[PDB]
Amino acid sequence: CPLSRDVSIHVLNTILEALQEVYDYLEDIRIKVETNNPQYYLEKQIFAPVERLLFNVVRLSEALG
């Protein structure tokens, strides 16, 4: 999905300090989603896809939900 595709694209770009940049990116996205600028889109549309792309799942889920 667009947002999900945008997240996937940026994440890949950085991966291909990098993993820290990734977590720092996701936190910011998380804030942007919750404030509607959420549970489902952060879990099924942002979390799961990244969990497959990429490392510590704990860091990610904490940077999300």
PDB file of C-alpha atoms in Angstrom:
ATOM      1  CA  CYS A   1       0.000   0.000   0.000  1.00  0.00           C
ATOM      2  CA  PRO A   2       1.298   3.591  -0.642  1.00  0.00           C
ATOM      3  CA  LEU A   3       2.437   4.406   2.919  1.00  0.00           C
ATOM      4  CA  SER A   4       3.552   0.809   3.355  1.00  0.00           C
ATOM      5  CA  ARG A   5       5.344   1.009  -0.002  1.00  0.00           C
ATOM      6  CA  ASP A   6       7.015   4.273   1.014  1.00  0.00           C
ATOM      7  CA  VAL A   7       8.258   2.756   4.263  1.00  0.00           C
ATOM      8  CA  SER A   8       9.493  -0.350   2.468  1.00  0.00           C
ATOM      9  CA  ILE A   9      11.314   1.753  -0.119  1.00  0.00           C
ATOM     10  CA  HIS A  10      13.110   3.973   2.385  1.00  0.00           C
ATOM     11  CA  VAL A  11      14.051   1.043   4.628  1.00  0.00           C
ATOM     12  CA  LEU A  12      15.580  -0.849   1.723  1.00  0.00           C
ATOM     13  CA  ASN A  13      17.408   2.256   0.504  1.00  0.00           C
ATOM     14  CA  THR A  14      19.119   2.629   3.884  1.00  0.00           C
ATOM     15  CA  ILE A  15      19.877  -1.088   4.317  1.00  0.00           C
ATOM     16  CA  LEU A  16      21.386  -1.466   0.841  1.00  0.00           C
ATOM     17  CA  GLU A  17      24.157   3.099  11.718  1.00  0.00           C
ATOM     18  CA  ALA A  18      21.841   1.813   8.987  1.00  0.00           C
ATOM     19  CA  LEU A  19      19.671  -0.257  11.340  1.00  0.00           C
ATOM     20  CA  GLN A  20      19.622   2.615  13.828  1.00  0.00           C
ATOM     21  CA  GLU A  21      18.536   4.957  11.045  1.00  0.00           C
ATOM     22  CA  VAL A  22      15.785   2.448  10.295  1.00  0.00           C
ATOM     23  CA  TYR A  23      14.463   2.400  13.863  1.00  0.00           C
ATOM     24  CA  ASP A  24      14.708   6.198  14.033  1.00  0.00           C
ATOM     25  CA  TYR A  25      12.698   6.407  10.818  1.00  0.00           C
ATOM     26  CA  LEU A  26       9.980   4.073  12.062  1.00  0.00           C
ATOM     27  CA  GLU A  27       9.520   5.915  15.376  1.00  0.00           C
ATOM     28  CA  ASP A  28       8.866   9.145  13.453  1.00  0.00           C
ATOM     29  CA  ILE A  29       6.448   7.386  11.090  1.00  0.00           C
ATOM     30  CA  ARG A  30       4.701   5.903  14.120  1.00  0.00           C
ATOM     31  CA  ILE A  31       4.110   9.319  15.586  1.00  0.00           C
ATOM     32  CA  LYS A  32       2.879  10.625  12.236  1.00  0.00           C
ATOM     33  CA  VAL A  33       0.360   7.763  12.005  1.00  0.00           C
ATOM     34  CA  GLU A  34      -1.052   7.978  15.541  1.00  0.00           C
ATOM     35  CA  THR A  35      -1.548  11.741  15.242  1.00  0.00           C
ATOM     36  CA  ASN A  36      -3.082  11.165  11.807  1.00  0.00           C
ATOM     37  CA  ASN A  37      -0.747  13.612  10.056  1.00  0.00           C
ATOM     38  CA  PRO A  38      -3.333   3.366  13.714  1.00  0.00           C
ATOM     39  CA  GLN A  39      -3.116  -0.068  15.359  1.00  0.00           C
ATOM     40  CA  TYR A  40      -3.787  -1.827  12.055  1.00  0.00           C
ATOM     41  CA  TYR A  41      -1.576   0.264   9.782  1.00  0.00           C
ATOM     42  CA  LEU A  42       1.364   0.164  12.197  1.00  0.00           C
ATOM     43  CA  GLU A  43       0.961  -3.559  12.814  1.00  0.00           C
ATOM     44  CA  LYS A  44      -0.185  -5.198   9.569  1.00  0.00           C
ATOM     45  CA  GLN A  45       0.966  -2.524   7.083  1.00  0.00           C
ATOM     46  CA  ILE A  46       4.210  -1.244   8.612  1.00  0.00           C
ATOM     47  CA  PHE A  47       5.450  -3.778  11.154  1.00  0.00           C
ATOM     48  CA  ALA A  48       4.903  -7.174   9.494  1.00  0.00           C
ATOM     49  CA  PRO A  49       6.346  -6.113   6.121  1.00  0.00           C
ATOM     50  CA  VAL A  50       9.495  -4.707   7.730  1.00  0.00           C
ATOM     51  CA  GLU A  51       9.852  -7.786   9.955  1.00  0.00           C
ATOM     52  CA  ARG A  52      10.086  -9.770   6.742  1.00  0.00           C
ATOM     53  CA  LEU A  53      12.395  -7.312   4.958  1.00  0.00           C
ATOM     54  CA  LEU A  54      14.941  -7.383   7.799  1.00  0.00           C
ATOM     55  CA  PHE A  55      18.328  -7.164  13.576  1.00  0.00           C
ATOM     56  CA  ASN A  56      16.051  -7.155  16.600  1.00  0.00           C
ATOM     57  CA  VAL A  57      12.278  -7.526  16.366  1.00  0.00           C
ATOM     58  CA  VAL A  58      12.036  -6.141  19.905  1.00  0.00           C
ATOM     59  CA  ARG A  59      13.542  -2.809  18.831  1.00  0.00           C
ATOM     60  CA  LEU A  60      11.072  -2.582  15.955  1.00  0.00           C
ATOM     61  CA  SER A  61       7.910  -3.514  17.864  1.00  0.00           C
ATOM     62  CA  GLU A  62       8.930  -1.081  20.612  1.00  0.00           C
ATOM     63  CA  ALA A  63       9.495   1.623  18.016  1.00  0.00           C
ATOM     64  CA  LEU A  64       5.924   0.736  16.927  1.00  0.00           C
ATOM     65  CA  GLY A  65       3.473  -1.373  19.000  1.00  0.00           C
TER      66      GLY A  65
END
